[PDB]
């Protein structure tokens, strides 16, 4: 692509600069260029990739929800056309992230920290597709999200402690997938409770900084449980 001529280190440096400047579309393009160099990503670089696309897709989701709400209230073709435009752009961003994961981030990820990270991302971007999907397409997209989250959960349970922030963020997202995508609120509440309780019991093993990292995500599980129960 357009980043083919730039050094991998220069693309990482510019991704960090774009983050400081709140230029998330540029940040995502720099990280897509870094991934396409073909080398595996470090933990910081995986985080840069994820923060970039999360901010990009976040703006699209927030816009899509405003438009869908106006369209539902209206039920001229303009509202539908514009909601479709934003939807197609959101789908394009998800297909881009999923394409990076499939070519070839996941297959080259052998360590649990990298493999769980990428599989959780795969679950998340299929979940964003499911938020805008309708009918049969929706069913298959939902199963793809479920499959990626499930594989990530299996690895996380075997290879990481229950306080691992990656394991905690995965369980949090899989719980929200269950609650509002899979229409399995009981599964969602069960997963959030078990995850919170198993992390609580392992907090005594952590340093002051690791404790802060784990408790931050546990508070998210608690916020959801408060609204669900």
């Amino acid at each position: 692509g357009a980043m083919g001529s730039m050094e991998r280190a220069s693309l990482i440096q510019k991704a960090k600069l774009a983050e400081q400047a709140e230029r998330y579309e540029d940040m995502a393009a720099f990280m897509k260029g870094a991934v396409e160099k073909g080398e595996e990503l470090s933990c910081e670089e995986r985080n840069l990739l994820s923060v970039a696309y999360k901010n990009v897709v976040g703006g699209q989701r927030a816009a899509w929800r405003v438009l869908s709400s106006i369209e539902q209230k209206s039920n001229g073709p303009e509202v539908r056309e514009y909601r479709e435009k934003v939807e197609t752009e959101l789908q394009g961003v998800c297909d881009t992230v999923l394409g990076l994961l499939d070519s070839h981030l996941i297959k080259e990820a052998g360590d649990a920290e990298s493999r769980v990270f990428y599989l959780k991302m795969k679950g998340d971007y299929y979940r964003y597709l499911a938020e805008v999907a309708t009918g049969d397409d929706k069913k298959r997209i939902i199963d793809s999200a479920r499959s990626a989250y499930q594989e990530a959960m299996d690895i996380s349970k075997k290879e990481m402690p229950p306080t691992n922030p990656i394991r905690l963020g995965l369980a949090l997202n899989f719980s929200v997938f269950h609650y509002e995508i899979a229409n399995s609120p009981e599964e969602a509440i069960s997963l959030a409770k078990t995850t919170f309780d198993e992390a609580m019991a392992d907090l005594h093993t952590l340093s002051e900084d690791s404790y802060k990292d784990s408790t931050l995500i546990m508070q998210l599980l608690r916020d959801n449980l408060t609204l669900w129960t």
């Binding site: 998330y24 994820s50 923060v51 999360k54 901010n55 990009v56 897709v57 976040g58 703006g59 989701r61 927030a62 929800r65 709400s69 959780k120 998340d124 963020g169 995965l170 949090l172 997202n173 929200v176 609650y179 509002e180 995500i217 998210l220 599980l221 916020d223 959801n224 609204l227």
Partner: peptide
């Protein structure tokens, strides 16, 4: 729509 807590930047 009421959005539940998910991992990372709350960008939406």
């Amino acid at each position: 729509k009421l959005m539940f807590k998910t991992e990372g930047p709350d960008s939406d």
